[PDB]
Amino acid sequence: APDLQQEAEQLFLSSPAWLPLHGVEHSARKWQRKTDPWSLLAVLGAPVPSDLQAQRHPTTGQILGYKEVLLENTNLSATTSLSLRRPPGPASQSLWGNPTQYPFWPGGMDEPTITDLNTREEAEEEIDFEKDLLTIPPGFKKGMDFAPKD
Amino acid sequence: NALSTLRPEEIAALLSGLVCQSPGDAGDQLPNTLKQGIERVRAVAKRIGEVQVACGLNQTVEEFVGELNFGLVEVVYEWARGMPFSELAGLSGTPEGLVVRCIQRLAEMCRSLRGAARLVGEPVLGAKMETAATLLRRDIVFAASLYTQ
Amino acid sequence: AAIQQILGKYKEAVAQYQMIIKKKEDYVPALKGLGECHLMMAKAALVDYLDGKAVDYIEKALEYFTCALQHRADVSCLWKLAGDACTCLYAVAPSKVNVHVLGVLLGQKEGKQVLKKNELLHLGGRCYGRALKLMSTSNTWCDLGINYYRQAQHLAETGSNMNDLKELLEKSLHCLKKAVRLDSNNHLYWNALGVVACYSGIGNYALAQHCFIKSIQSEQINAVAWTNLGVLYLTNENIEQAHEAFKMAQSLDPSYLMCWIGQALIAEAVGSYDTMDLFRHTTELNMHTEGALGYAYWVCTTLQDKSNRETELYQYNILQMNAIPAAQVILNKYVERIQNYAPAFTMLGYLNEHLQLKKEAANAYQRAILLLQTAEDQDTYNVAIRNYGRLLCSTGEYDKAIQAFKSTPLEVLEDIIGFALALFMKGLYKESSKAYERALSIVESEQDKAHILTALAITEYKQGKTDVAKTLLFKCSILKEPTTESLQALCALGLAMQDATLSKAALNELLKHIKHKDSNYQRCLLTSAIYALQGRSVAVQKQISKAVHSNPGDPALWSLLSRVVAQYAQRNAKGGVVAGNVAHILDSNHGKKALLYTAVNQLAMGSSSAEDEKNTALKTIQKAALLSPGDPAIWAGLMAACHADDKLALVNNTQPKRIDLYLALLSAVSASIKDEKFFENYNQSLEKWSLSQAVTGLIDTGRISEAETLCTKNLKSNPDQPAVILLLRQVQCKPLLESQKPLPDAVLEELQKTVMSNSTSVPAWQWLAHVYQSQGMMRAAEMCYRKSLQLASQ
Amino acid sequence: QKHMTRTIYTSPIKALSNQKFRDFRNTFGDVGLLTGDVQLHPEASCLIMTTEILRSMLYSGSDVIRDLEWVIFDEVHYINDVERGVVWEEVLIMLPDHVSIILLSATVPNALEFADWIGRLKRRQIYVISTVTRPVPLEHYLFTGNSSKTQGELFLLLDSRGAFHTKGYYAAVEAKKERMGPAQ
Amino acid sequence: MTNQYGILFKQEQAHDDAIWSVAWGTNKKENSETVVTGSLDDLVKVWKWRDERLDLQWSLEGHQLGVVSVDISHTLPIAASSSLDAHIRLWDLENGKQIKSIDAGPVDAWTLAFSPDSQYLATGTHVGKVNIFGVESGKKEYSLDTRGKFILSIAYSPDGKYLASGAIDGIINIFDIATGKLLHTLEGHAMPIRSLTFSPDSQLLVTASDDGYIKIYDVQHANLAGTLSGHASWVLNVAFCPDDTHFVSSSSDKSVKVWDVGTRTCVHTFFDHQDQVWGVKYNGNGSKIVSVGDDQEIHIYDCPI
Amino acid sequence: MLFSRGLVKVLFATETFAMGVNMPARTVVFDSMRKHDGSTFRDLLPGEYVQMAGRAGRRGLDPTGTVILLCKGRVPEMADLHRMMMGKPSQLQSQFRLTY
RNA sequence: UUUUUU
């Protein structure tokens, strides 16, 4: 090791950097805060309504060709539907202890009775988008009054 | 705000009062923080039993609060520092199976609270329950079963 | 493969699809599956802020989709998936998007093309339109509307235009309204209409509220719609009702990110106490931009306030939740996503500075400099220059630091002080002195005045002029209260001149009224150096022993005691070994020096043990070499240990081992010295000792020729120095006198003459006396030994 | 295992479902175990669980229920417990219809008023099988100390044919009378 | 919710002094499972994990000082070792006898690493370079250069085309083997690195410095994906699992942690050693971990898949 | 695991061995008739006794199995021995209740 | 004074 005297001289008289005058503190810097809550708006996309399913020769079935057909059980989710047609799940997931997920139907219960027969494809109902706008959220007492846009 | 403001080696001893299933008593040689946290926990239980009995339920406040039976607070508090089992065996009069069972039933609850503090939005309880769990399982209390391996 | 894709597990599905494709190449369903897997991988990549991986994945997905569309281009789902792929790269920081599209997609099939962002989004719109042409469903209508929305958003966000994108927005509204009327029982279409309707270009809030309410009525389990109402109310100064909407949203889905961020924003607005924790929770869930900036802001603000460091806010949260590293990672991701905002860069520089990552801090400040060239406020540009220059000076490149400090008005204390230090670092001591004086003029907060006086003393001392430095340091002492830094500098200044008069006075002054200093190692070092100055050389060790008695903790003190016993009074070798061992035990990071010193003490001791393995000098020096292979002392210690082990084995008479490594160790010593900043005298001494030891070791083992060539090369480097020439004489005269021979008085006289050249060295005299004894001139040997004794005693 | 489906074996006692794990893994293939702390192989086709875990993954979906064929309720006479009998009925109610049930028991009298409840709670017929006459029958003796040095006399009070013997009781009581804490 | 981790075997005193490195190799096509360890001795003992226990097979030795790094090959039966002895002698592993000996001092080699095809055996020097020798074909065809400091860690990507190098003072350099050109230099930590590892498929590079943190970079860009801080002292090794989901780290605080890269959290900690743990590795289909420590012991754990 | 290979010869078990494990043995010997439950000091109900007694015979290694009662304090009081040693085990009740 | 599980 070096001798004590030069060790001390290097430690103190080598340069003025070691002084508290030149440290990382001793500036008292400030920053300004700028929030942006419009970034929070989220729009999700619709699923694909087609699958390209195979064909089967009516006798001794063989795949003649692949034809596209319409899927039927979309818009069903694991947290809003309780049937064995809903999408599998989020991912590999905790086996138990999961709120926000639905059990399957309990076996003594079927609970399916509805037809709702419109089945149109050009079913545009002519909704009015500016006549009478509903301004009360479900559960509140009052909404907010925005000025009409001309 | 009962549990949030304690050390991680104290929240485990405070929560040991829900699990022990052993003859119970209070203590003397206990810190002040534990001896006051026990009172806070007992007050929260008293409030819950008081809103239970004032509705039509038939379970008296005393019967609800009597499930809280501390008496392993000191033993768990000493266990979660690095103290080996032998000194615990000397410490107090409970059979050494009923102690390993209580510690095993506490390290499995201080891990579902890690899951619930992340759900409420309490990141300081999550970081204390994820410590009080890793310091609680080290030795023959958690020896692997012969059958399993 | 399809089943594996359904359940996640994208890599296995990709491998299976590729195995299928190798056999058959035109199999459309396999191609479609491969494209879909890559698209999903890209979206997962964009959830973490990895924007390069996503671009790669989408490029590959487009490859597969065009390959599939070549065979059957009548199917609709393929075109829709192509449009999905093209439009999922919004908000990916353009100049990061260059996509190698090829073939049918751009109408005619020519070669390849590299597309930028706007072009990619436009191609996406074309793909959805073409898919919709041949199968008119609602989902494609809604997706086309969203794509037009993204195109308008990109045009506005680059400030390229405004009011010349109106037709694009009206087209988007037309498509979205068509989708809603085609099936008015789907929460998705109403929600998409609501989001688009409140875009800054349209600004129809009544329709937006109506759309969000309709979406909620359609499906009660809807966090997205509730959070969208919360945002709408929050921006129009309605904190209470927005708070209610956010509360409903998180009640329905506790792990949705936007609602938690909204709660944090509301807590910040009304000035609550759990806003920092809310931002931390947001960071822990997943990486959003707004939560990232909020958490970083709060971490920096907490670091500024210096009344914290007992609070259990600073201590627990910051130092046991690792807030600083978490904030740094968060800011890196944010900055790569956004990259046109300066405060983010300055906070990143500050955090990097606290992690002592100085190069990265310089880069951050540099980018902030580039952004801030033109702005309404010039104060932030000057502060950025000061910080960048200061960090640049901290790690080499002094000229760049000087240039950076040039481009600012040097009128505030910070700029002048930084300029002075950069100037001093480069050289130019007079310039630094002038700058420090100029800074001294405009000074408040007398602590800084004392520090500037101390800096003045140091800088002029460098030139010489110790008298003026001394008077200036006394002038600093005349201030109301000393600073414990002027006193230490005064002691060191006294030590630089070999006079203990003022050093003792300064030390007594330092001890007298200063207790708030908490180093406790520096005072001991100064006290010991003062005692050594007077040549006492036993008191030194006694003084350090006193210091260790006071504070039996403090590994540093134990390590220093071991070092001093090795250097001064090496007759307590055993005690030194114990002290080094204690220092090493009482921590781990003092391993390096403590092991070096205990090894040297063990060398001095000899072999005074029970001939026990695993604790000899060789083992400890090897342990130290594994810990820190950087200093040259460990390698020199290794050379000494090998030689000593050979002699001990020879005494025990079993076998010499560890024979030929001296040349490699010498190379290691020189290479290691080359990178040490400055202890010049010590480095020169170390190199000289190592050279001598290597030559002697080579002579002993028996490789005479290598010793000769090494010595000759050293003399060929520089003119003669009377030390190495003695080494050359020794290597020369080894073969002769190994076999009996008489030597001629000419050679013998020459050797004697060479020895007088380098006097004041007892070894040399002993070796010459051995030569005389070998030939046999006994009385002459006696005289040479007598000279060595006289020299040693003096 | 022959049909590629999955099966759940559920036992109430934490220590009883460990050697069952050992014996089912030694006898055939893959057998996962799930308990309060153990989680060996939650991907096998013979998961062994305590009923409070199946009751907890019936309330959510858990996507294991999609592959079941059999649920082997092991000790179904714990329905009579006072603090845990509600678990067995939350499970037997919430089970979907495509999952067949096996109920091992311990010779209760009203087995047809319980299988009838499960038969019309679901809408499937349930077959009741009941046995008697266990192998290796057992003779219930009575040992009262006498001539403790070597001699030991055992009085028979119940035999391998179910016939109660009052003779053995009288002989035992009289020997006790003639003979008439840790040291004994 | 975590899996069932635990010890299977514990060799009581393998060597006579500290054990400084370990390599686990499933070299042969059959089930061989050979473990090679080097210590503060000359010994380079070659163990075999046969069915449920380690049986010592070779005790081969030719070194003069302590061994600082050992390595094994996946194709051939072969091994290499370097020491403070200034020699890189490479063994045979079948008859237990030395094959070659390469002269190289602390200015020519510190730590070993074979190629993916077991052909080149790169090492890190003192003056900053990386020296690539040639096994079975002589010595020192070429050296990659990074203008830096002493270099401690060397890693090869499993698929080839990447070589990474940590150094004293922190900086990290990534080369591509195809052309030998520096891709990019990370600034990383502020204290020595002394361990690096790629992931299978080579898209994730994991460092472990001297200050306690474990950076997780991302290759083909400069993105870092997080900082893992759960140790209480230096970190001395990181080994990445055969499936790209976990990795194991041994620190100088007597503890072996198992992380997972999906959520960047510590699943299980092993508290079984009694002194600094200098080496951790996986095996083949990663389901067991070997850990050699400062106290002379060899632990083998059980990490079920 | 040492009782399932016959390397241990006498086991001083309690009810935890009667329920939680299987491990058949040759001769089961009781020690009393009444076990405490909840401040009651009740005697063995027919359902319990059958289980512990039932794991007495082994499989093909012996003709029968002997269950030894070990009355020491007073007379066995055969009246309660009748209802304990033979008796309908228990009906199958339903402890349904509401939890939160 | 027996026994127990998320």
Separation in Å, CA of C615 to nearest CA in chain A: 22
Q: Is the dihedral of CA D34, D37, D38, D39 positive or negative?
A: positive
Contact with chain E for residue C359, Cβ under 8 A: yes
Q: Do chains F and A touch (3 or more CB pairs under 8 A)?
A: no
Q: Residue E120's closest CA among E88, E85, E93, E151?
A: E88
CB C661 within 8 A of CB A29: no
CB C67 within 8 A of CB C89: no
Chain D CB contacts of E304 under 8 Å are 40-41
Please report how the helices C632-652 and C680-701 are oriented relative to each other, as an axis angle in degrees rounded to 10. 30
Q: Note the helical H segments in chain D.
A: 16-27, 51-54, 56-59, 85-94, 115-121, 166-179
Structure tokens at E236: 């001395």
- One-character DSSP codes across C112-174: -EEE-HHHHHHHHHHHHHHHHHHS--HHHHHHHHHHHHHHHHHHHHTTS-SSSSHHHHHHHHH
Cα–Cα dist C186/C190, whole Å? 7
Q: Residue F86's closest CA among E288, D162, C178, C272?
A: D162
Token pair 């996962």 is found at D32
Separation in Å, CA of B135 to nearest CA in chain E: 10
Q: Note the helical H segments in C219-288.
A: 223-235, 239-252, 257-269, 275-285
Please state, as a whole number, how many other Cβ atoms lie within 10 Å of the Cβ of residue F47: 16
b/e map of E141-161 (b: 16 or more CB within 10 Å)? eebbebebbbbbbbbbbeeee
Structure tokens at C34: 């491969």
Domain encompassing residue E37: 1-305
- Closest nucleotide to D36: CA versus each C1': G6
Rama region for E55: left / alpha / beta (φ>0; ψ in -120 to 50; rest): beta
Cα–Cα dist C124/C83, whole Å? 4
- Best D17, D19, D37, D48 member to test B by mutation, with max B CBs in 10 Å, is D37
E107 and C668 within 8 Å at the Cβ level: the answer is: yes
D39 and E304 within 8 Å at the Cβ level: the answer is: no
Pick the residue from chain D with its C-alpha nearest to B144.
D38
User: What is the residue type of C717?
Assistant: S
Q: Is the dihedral of CA C577, C580, C586, C592 positive or negative?
A: negative
- One-character DSSP codes across C373-442: SS-S--HHHHHHHHHHHHHHHHSS-HHHHHHHHHSS---SHHHHHHHHHHHHHHS-HHHHHHHHHHHHHS
Answer whether any strand G atom is within 7 A of the Cβ of F6. Answer: no
Q: Report residues 124-183 of D contacting strand G, contact meaning Cβ closer than 7 Å.
A: none
Cα–Cα dist B36/D91, whole Å? 42
C284 and B122 within 8 Å at the Cβ level: the answer is: no
Method in brief: cryo-EM
Structure tokens at D173: 């009581």
Distance D75 CA to G5 C1' (A): 14
Q: Could you tell me which residues come within 8 angstroms of residue C243 by beta carbon, excluding any fewer than 6 positions away?
A: C230, C263, C266
Distance B94 CA to G5 C1' (A): 21
Integer angstrom CA distances of residue E97 from E23, E59, E62, E91: 18, 10, 9, 6
CB D145 within 8 A of CB F90: no
CB C392 within 8 A of CB C424: no
Distance B90 CA to G4 C1' (A): 26
Please report how the helices C187-197 and C166-182 are oriented relative to each other, as an axis angle in degrees rounded to 10. 160
Angstrom resolution of this structure: 3.1
CA C566 to the chain's CA centroid: 35
Kind plus residue range of the DSSP H or E element containing B51: helix B32-53
CB E116 within 8 A of CB E156: yes
CB E17 within 8 A of CB C614: yes
Classify burial at C642, counting beta carbons within 10 Å of its beta carbon; exposed 0-12, middle 13-18, buried 19 or more: buried
Rama region for E148: left / alpha / beta (φ>0; ψ in -120 to 50; rest): beta
- Report the neighbours of A using a cutoff of 3 or more CB pairs below 8 angstroms: C, D
Cα–Cα dist D13/F16, whole Å? 10
Cα–Cα dist B34/B14, whole Å? 7
Structure tokens at C368: 């902030």
- One-character DSSP codes across C517-569: ----SHHHHHHHHHHHHTT--SHHHHHHHHHHHH-S--HHHHHHHHHHHHHS-
Q: After which residues is chain C broken (C to N over 2.5 A)?
A: none
Contact with chain F for residue D68, Cβ under 8 A: no
**Which strands form D48-49's sheet, in the order they lie side by side?**
D48-49, D6-10, D68-73, D100-103
Distance F14 CA to G5 C1' (A): 20
- Alpha carbons within 13 A on the beta-carbon side of E229: 16
Pick the residue from chain A with its C-alpha nearest to C678.
A10
- Best B103, B137, B148, B149 member to test D by mutation, with max D CBs in 10 Å, is B148
Chain B CB contacts of D19 under 8 Å are 147
Answer whether any strand G atom is within 7 A of the Cβ of D57. Answer: no
Structure tokens at C211: 């759309």
Answer whether any strand G atom is within 7 A of the Cβ of F100. Answer: no
Q: How many secondary structure helices (H) and strands (E) does chain C include?
A: 41, 2
CB C716 within 8 A of CB C675: no
Structure tokens at E274: 């009694």
Q: Is the dihedral of CA C319, C325, C328, C333 positive or negative?
A: negative
Cα–Cα dist E153/E124, whole Å? 7
Cα–Cα dist A42/E103, whole Å? 65
Q: Residue C365's closest CA among C340, C379, C386?
A: C386
Cα–Cα dist C283/C285, whole Å? 6
Classify burial at B64, counting beta carbons within 10 Å of its beta carbon; exposed 0-12, middle 13-18, buried 19 or more: middle
- Closest nucleotide to D14: CA versus each C1': G5
Nucleotide G1, nearest residue via CA and C1': F36
Cα–Cα dist C59/C101, whole Å? 7
Inter-chain CB pairs, B–E, below 8 Å = 10
B121 and C321 within 8 Å at the Cβ level: the answer is: no
Answer whether any strand G atom is within 7 A of the Cβ of F55. Answer: no
Cα–Cα dist C320/C336, whole Å? 28
CB C77 within 8 A of CB A50: yes
D121 and A106 within 8 Å at the Cβ level: the answer is: no
Output DSSP code: residue C316. I
Output DSSP code: residue C315. I
Q: What are E300's strand-pairing partners?
A: E9, E290
- Alpha carbons within 13 A on the beta-carbon side of C738: 11
Token pair 């194709």 is found at E75
Answer whether any strand G atom is within 7 A of the Cβ of D52. Answer: yes
CB C618 within 8 A of CB C602: no
Q: Residue C558's closest CA among C539, C585, C526, C530?
A: C585
Kind plus residue range of the DSSP H or E element containing F51: helix F46-54
Q: Could you tell me which residues come within 8 angstroms of residue C360 by beta carbon, excluding any fewer than 6 positions away?
A: C352, E187
Q: Residue E60's closest CA among E90, E19, E17?
A: E90
- Closest nucleotide to D55: CA versus each C1': G6
Classify burial at C330, counting beta carbons within 10 Å of its beta carbon; exposed 0-12, middle 13-18, buried 19 or more: buried
Answer whether any strand G atom is within 7 A of the Cβ of F9. Answer: no
CB C686 within 8 A of CB C673: yes
CB C401 within 8 A of CB C391: no
Classify burial at D161, counting beta carbons within 10 Å of its beta carbon; exposed 0-12, middle 13-18, buried 19 or more: exposed
- Report the neighbours of B using a cutoff of 3 or more CB pairs below 8 angstroms: C, D, E
Chain E CB contacts of B149 under 8 Å are 4, 6, 8, 302
Please state, as a whole number, how many other Cβ atoms lie within 10 Å of the Cβ of residue B83: 13
Token pair 């999700």 is found at A44
The SS3 of residue C35 is: helix
D114 and F92 within 8 Å at the Cβ level: the answer is: yes
The SS3 of residue E58 is: strand
Integer angstrom CA distances of residue C763 from C707, C785, E231: 19, 10, 52
Structure tokens at F67: 């269950």
CB C281 within 8 A of CB B121: yes
Q: What are E197's strand-pairing partners?
A: E206
Token pair 């030689």 is found at C643
Output DSSP code: residue F7. -
Our CA angle for C554, C556, C559, nearest 5°, is 125
Distance D9 CA to G1 C1' (A): 34
Q: Residue B114's closest CA among E266, C326, D52?
A: E266
The length of chain C, given as a count of residues: 794
Contact with chain C for residue A102, Cβ under 8 A: no
Which residue pairs, CB below 8 angstroms and at least 24 apart, start in B65-69? B67/B18, B68/B17, B68/B18, B68/B41, B68/B42, B69/B17, B69/B20, B69/B21, B69/B22, B69/B24
Nucleotide G4, nearest residue via CA and C1': D13
Nucleotide G6, nearest residue via CA and C1': D52
C290 and A37 within 8 Å at the Cβ level: the answer is: yes
Chain A CB contacts of D121 under 8 Å are 108
Nearest to E224 among C322, C329, C625 (CB): C329
Residues on D contacting A at a C-beta cutoff of 8 Å: 34, 42, 53, 56-66, 93-97, 99, 121-123
b/e map of C506-540 (b: 16 or more CB within 10 Å)? bbebbeeeeeeeeeeebbbbbbbbbbbbeeeeebb
D63 and A107 within 8 Å at the Cβ level: the answer is: no
Q: How many domains does chain E have?
A: 1
Cα–Cα dist E208/E234, whole Å? 9
Chain D CB contacts of E2 under 8 Å are 39
Cα–Cα dist C406/F2, whole Å? 86
B148 and E269 within 8 Å at the Cβ level: the answer is: no
Cα–Cα dist C27/C33, whole Å? 10
Integer angstrom CA distances of residue E79 from C542, E24, E113, E153, E197: 53, 11, 10, 18, 19
Quote the strand ranges of A14-122, DSSP E. Answer: 53-54, 66-67
Cα–Cα dist B88/B99, whole Å? 9
Output DSSP code: residue A47. P
Chain A CB contacts of C347 under 8 Å are 31
E66 and C50 within 8 Å at the Cβ level: the answer is: no
Cα–Cα dist C431/E283, whole Å? 64
Largest CA distance in chain A: 102
Structure tokens at C666: 């010498």
Rama region for A86: left / alpha / beta (φ>0; ψ in -120 to 50; rest): beta
Distance D58 CA to G1 C1' (A): 38
D109 and F65 within 8 Å at the Cβ level: the answer is: no
Cα–Cα dist C167/F35, whole Å? 88
CB C374 within 8 A of CB C355: no
Question: What does the CA dihedral C366, C367, C368, C374 come to, rounded to 10 degrees?
Answer: 100
In the 3-class helix/strand/coil scheme, how is C347-382 assigned residue by residue? HHHHHHHHCCCHHHHHHHHHHHHHHCCCCCCCHHHH
Cα–Cα dist E156/E130, whole Å? 12
Integer angstrom CA distances of residue B85 from B25, B72, B88: 21, 14, 5
User: What is the residue type of A124?
Assistant: E
In the 3-class helix/strand/coil scheme, how is C190-219 assigned residue by residue? HHHHHHHHCCCCCCCHHHHHHHHHHHHHHC
Q: After which residues is chain F broken (C to N over 2.5 A)?
A: none
Cα–Cα dist E63/E23, whole Å? 18
Structure tokens at D18: 């460990």
Output DSSP code: residue E203. -
Cα–Cα dist C524/C548, whole Å? 10
